[PDB]
CSV table of C-alpha atoms and ligand atoms in Angstrom, one decimal:
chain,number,residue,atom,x,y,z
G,67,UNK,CA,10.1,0.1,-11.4
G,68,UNK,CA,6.9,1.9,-10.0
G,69,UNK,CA,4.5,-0.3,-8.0
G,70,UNK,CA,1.5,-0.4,-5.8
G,71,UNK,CA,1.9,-2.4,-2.6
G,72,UNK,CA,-1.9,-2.6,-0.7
G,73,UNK,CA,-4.1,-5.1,1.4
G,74,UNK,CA,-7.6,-4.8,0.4
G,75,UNK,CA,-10.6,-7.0,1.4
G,76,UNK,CA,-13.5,-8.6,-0.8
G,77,UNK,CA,-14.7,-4.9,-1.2
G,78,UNK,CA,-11.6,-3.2,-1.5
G,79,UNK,CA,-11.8,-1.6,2.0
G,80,UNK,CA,-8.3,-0.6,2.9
G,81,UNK,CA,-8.8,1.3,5.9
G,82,UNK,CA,-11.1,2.5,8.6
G,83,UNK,CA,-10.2,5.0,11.2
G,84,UNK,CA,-6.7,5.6,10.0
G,85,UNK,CA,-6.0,1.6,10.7
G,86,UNK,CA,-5.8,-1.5,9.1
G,87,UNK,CA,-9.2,-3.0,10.0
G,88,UNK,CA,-7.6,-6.5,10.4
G,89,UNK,CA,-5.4,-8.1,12.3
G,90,UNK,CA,-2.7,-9.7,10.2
G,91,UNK,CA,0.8,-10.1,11.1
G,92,UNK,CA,1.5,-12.5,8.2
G,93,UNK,CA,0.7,-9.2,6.0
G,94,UNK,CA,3.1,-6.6,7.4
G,95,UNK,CA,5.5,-9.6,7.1
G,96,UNK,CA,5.2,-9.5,3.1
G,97,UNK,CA,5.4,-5.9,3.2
G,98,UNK,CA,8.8,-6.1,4.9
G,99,UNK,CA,9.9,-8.9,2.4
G,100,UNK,CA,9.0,-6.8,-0.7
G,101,UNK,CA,9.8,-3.2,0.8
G,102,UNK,CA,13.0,-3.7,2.6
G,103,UNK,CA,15.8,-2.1,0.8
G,104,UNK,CA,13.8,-0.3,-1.5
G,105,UNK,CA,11.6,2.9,-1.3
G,106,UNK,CA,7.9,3.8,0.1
G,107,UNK,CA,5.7,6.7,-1.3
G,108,UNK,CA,3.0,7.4,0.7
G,109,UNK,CA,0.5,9.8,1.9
G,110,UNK,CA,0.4,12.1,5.4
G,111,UNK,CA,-2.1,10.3,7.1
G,112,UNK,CA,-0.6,6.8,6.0
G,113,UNK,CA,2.5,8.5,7.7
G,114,UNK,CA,1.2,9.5,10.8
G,115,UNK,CA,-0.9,5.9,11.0
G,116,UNK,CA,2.6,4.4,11.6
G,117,UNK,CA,3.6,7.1,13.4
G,118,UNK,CA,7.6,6.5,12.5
G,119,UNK,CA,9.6,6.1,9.6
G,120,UNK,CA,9.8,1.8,8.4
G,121,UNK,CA,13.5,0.9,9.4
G,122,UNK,CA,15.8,-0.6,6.2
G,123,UNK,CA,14.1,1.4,3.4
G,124,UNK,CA,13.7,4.7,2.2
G,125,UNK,CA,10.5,6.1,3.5
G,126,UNK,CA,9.1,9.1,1.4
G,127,UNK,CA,5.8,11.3,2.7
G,128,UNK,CA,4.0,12.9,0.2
G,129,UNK,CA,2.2,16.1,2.0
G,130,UNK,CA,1.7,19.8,1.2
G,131,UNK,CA,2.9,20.7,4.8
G,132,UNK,CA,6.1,23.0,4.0
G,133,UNK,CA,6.9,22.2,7.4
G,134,UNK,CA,7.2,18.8,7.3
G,135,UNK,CA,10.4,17.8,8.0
G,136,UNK,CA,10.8,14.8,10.1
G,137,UNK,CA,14.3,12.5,10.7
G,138,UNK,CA,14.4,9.3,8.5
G,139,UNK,CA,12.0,10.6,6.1
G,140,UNK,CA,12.2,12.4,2.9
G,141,UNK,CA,9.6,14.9,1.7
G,142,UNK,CA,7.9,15.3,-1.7
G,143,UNK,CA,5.0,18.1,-2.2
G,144,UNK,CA,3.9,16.7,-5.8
G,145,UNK,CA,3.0,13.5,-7.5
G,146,UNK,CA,5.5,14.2,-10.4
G,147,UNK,CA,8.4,14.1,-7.4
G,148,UNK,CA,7.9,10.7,-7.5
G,149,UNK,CA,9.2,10.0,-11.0
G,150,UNK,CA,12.8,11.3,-9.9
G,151,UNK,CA,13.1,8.2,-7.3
G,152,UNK,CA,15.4,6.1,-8.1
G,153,UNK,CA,15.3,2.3,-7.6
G,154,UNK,CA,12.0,0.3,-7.1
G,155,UNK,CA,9.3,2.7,-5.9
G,156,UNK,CA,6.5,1.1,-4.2
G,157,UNK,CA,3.2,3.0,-3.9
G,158,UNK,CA,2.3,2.7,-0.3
G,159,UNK,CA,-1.1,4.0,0.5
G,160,UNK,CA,-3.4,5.6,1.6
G,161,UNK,CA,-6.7,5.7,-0.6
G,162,UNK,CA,-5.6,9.2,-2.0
G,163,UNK,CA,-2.0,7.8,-3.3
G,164,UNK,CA,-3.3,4.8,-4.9
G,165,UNK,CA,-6.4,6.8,-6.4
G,166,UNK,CA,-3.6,9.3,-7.8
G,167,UNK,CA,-1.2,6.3,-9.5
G,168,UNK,CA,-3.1,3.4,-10.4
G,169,UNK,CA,-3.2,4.4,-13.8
G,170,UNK,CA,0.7,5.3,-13.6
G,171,UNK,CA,1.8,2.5,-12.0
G,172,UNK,CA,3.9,-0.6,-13.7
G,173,UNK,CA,2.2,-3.8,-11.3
G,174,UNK,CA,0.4,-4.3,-7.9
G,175,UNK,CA,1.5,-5.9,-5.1
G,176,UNK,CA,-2.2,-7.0,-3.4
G,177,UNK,CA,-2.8,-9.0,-0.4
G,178,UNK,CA,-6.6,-9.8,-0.8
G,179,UNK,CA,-7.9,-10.2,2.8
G,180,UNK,CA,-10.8,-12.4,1.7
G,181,UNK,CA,-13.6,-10.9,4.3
G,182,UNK,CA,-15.8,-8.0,4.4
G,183,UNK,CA,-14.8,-5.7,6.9
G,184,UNK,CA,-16.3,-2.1,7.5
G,185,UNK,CA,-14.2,0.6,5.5
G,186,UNK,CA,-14.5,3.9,5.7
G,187,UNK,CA,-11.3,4.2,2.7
G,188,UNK,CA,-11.3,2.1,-0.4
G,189,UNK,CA,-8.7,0.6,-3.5
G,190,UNK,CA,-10.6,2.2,-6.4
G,191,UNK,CA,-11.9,-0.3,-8.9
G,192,UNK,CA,-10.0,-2.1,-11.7
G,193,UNK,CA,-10.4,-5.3,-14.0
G,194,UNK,CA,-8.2,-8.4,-14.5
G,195,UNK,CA,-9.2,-7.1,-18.6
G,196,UNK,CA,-6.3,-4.7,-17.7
G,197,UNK,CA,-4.1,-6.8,-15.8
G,198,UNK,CA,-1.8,-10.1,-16.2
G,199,UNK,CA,-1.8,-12.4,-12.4
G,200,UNK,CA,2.1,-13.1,-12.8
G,201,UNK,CA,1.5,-14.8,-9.5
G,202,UNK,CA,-1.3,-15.6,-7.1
G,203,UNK,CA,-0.3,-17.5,-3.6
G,204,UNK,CA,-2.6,-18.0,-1.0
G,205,UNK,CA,-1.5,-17.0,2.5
G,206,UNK,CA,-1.1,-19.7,5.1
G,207,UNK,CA,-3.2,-19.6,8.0
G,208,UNK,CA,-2.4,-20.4,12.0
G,209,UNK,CA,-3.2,-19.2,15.2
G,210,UNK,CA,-1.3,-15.4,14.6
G,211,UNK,CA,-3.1,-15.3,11.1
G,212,UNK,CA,-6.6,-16.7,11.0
G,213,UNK,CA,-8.5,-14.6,7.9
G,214,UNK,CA,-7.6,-16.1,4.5
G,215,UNK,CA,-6.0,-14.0,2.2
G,216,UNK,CA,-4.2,-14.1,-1.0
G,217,UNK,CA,-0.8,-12.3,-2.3
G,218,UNK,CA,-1.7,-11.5,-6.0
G,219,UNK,CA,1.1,-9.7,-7.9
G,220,UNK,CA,-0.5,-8.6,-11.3
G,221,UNK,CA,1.2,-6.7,-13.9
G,222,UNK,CA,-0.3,-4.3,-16.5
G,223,UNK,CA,-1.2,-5.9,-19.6
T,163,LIG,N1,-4.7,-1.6,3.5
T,163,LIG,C1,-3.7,-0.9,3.0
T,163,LIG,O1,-2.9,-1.4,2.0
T,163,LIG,C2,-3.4,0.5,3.4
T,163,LIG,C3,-2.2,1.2,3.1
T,163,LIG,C4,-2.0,2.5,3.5
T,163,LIG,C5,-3.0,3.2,4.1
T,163,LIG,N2,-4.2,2.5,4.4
T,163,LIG,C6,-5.3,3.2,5.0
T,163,LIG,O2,-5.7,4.3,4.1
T,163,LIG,C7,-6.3,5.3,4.9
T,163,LIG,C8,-5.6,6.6,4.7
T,163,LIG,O3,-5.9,7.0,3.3
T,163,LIG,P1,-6.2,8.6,3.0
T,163,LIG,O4,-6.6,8.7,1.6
T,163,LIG,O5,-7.2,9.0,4.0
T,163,LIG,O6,-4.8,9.3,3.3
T,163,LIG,P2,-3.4,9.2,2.7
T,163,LIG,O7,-3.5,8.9,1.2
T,163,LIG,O8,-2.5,8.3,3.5
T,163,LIG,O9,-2.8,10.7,2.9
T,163,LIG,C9,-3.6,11.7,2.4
T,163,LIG,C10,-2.7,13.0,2.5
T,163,LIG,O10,-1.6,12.7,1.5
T,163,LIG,C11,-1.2,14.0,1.0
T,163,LIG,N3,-1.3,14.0,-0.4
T,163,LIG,C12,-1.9,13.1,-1.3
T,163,LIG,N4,-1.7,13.5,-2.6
T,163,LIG,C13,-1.1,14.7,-2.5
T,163,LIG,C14,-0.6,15.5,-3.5
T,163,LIG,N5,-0.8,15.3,-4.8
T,163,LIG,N6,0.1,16.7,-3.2
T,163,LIG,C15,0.3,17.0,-1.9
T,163,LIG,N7,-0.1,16.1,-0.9
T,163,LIG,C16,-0.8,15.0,-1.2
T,163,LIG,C17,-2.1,15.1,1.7
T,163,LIG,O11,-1.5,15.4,2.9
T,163,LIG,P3,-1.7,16.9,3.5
T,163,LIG,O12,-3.1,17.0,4.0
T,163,LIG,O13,-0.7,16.9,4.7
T,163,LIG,O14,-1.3,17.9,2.4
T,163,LIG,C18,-3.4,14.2,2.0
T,163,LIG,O15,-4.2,14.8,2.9
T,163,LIG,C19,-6.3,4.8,6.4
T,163,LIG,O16,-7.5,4.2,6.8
T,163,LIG,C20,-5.1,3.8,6.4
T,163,LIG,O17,-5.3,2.9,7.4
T,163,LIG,C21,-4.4,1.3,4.0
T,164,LIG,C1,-2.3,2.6,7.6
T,164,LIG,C2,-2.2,1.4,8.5
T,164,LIG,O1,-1.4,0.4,7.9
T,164,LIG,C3,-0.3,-0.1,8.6
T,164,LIG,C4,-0.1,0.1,10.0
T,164,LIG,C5,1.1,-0.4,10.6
T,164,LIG,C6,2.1,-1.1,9.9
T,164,LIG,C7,3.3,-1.6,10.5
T,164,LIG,C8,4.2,-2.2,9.7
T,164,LIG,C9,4.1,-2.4,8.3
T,164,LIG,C10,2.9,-2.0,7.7
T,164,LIG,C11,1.9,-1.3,8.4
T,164,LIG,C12,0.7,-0.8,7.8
T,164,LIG,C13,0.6,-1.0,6.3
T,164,LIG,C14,0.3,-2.3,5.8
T,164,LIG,C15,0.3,-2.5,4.4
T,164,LIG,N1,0.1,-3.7,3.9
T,164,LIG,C16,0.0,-3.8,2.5
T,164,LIG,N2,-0.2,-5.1,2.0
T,164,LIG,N3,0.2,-2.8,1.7
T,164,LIG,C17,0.5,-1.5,2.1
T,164,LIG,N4,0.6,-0.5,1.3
T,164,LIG,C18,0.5,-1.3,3.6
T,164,LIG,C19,0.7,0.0,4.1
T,164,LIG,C20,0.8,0.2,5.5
T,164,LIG,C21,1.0,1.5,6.1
């Protein structure tokens, strides 16, 4: 199974500055449910965001830096690399990644961060015409976790 995993707010802003422009711990929580034991594709700068591999999954960096060869990841220089994964292969960001699959991939993992925040890196555009919500779960909100959002888990129709 190929999938997109992303957090994108009312806008689909996903980014700004090489960071998540929100604060969400409740977020990186689902990631690690979904993620952990499986694999993550994503893009250099995504990469160097987190700065290290995520421990308890396979972490793949797509880059065209032939000397990128860093401990606890794996390398890929071309999209069609990732077909060869075995296993369920989450598409992990950044803009160009999810740009370059959304048309290849099988379902979306989305947290929708239901605010506007300023982006300078976007989700590109796509219809529910396209796409069957299997599952939408609003987030629970406290004191660690105070902007509403919603995990939505659509599947290609
Ligand atoms: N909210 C979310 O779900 C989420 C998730 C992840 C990231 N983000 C955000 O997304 C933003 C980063 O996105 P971005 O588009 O700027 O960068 P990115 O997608 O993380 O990385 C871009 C880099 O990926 C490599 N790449 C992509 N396609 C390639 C291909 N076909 N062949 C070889 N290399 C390829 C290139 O690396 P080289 O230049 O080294 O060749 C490219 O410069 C940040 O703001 C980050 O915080 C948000
Ligand atoms: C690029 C900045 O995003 C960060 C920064 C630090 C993180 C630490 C732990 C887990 C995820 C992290 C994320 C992060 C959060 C994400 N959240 C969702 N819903 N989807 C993705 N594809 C994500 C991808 C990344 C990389």
């Amino acid at each position: 199974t190929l999938s997109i995993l992303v957090a994108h707010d009312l806008q689909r802003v996903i980014g700004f500055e090489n960071q998540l422009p929100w604060h969400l711990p409740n977020d990186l929580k689902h990631v690690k449910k979904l993620s952990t034991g499986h694999t993550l594709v994503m893009g250099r700068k995504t990469f160097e965001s987190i700065g290290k591999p995520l421990p308890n999954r396979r972490n793949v960096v797509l880059t065209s830096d032939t000397s990128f060869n860093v401990e606890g990841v794996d390398v890929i220089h071309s999209i069609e690399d990732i077909y060869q994964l075995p296993g369920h292969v989450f598409i992990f960001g950044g803009q160009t990644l999810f740009e370059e699959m959304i048309d290849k991939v099988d379902d979306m993992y989305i947290t929708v961060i239901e605010g506007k925040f300023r982006g300078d890196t976007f989700f590109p555009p796509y219809t529910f015409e396209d796409w069957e919500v299997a599952s939408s779960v609003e987030g629970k909100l406290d004191e660690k976790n105070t902007i509403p959002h919603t995990f939505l888990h659509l599947i290609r129709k």
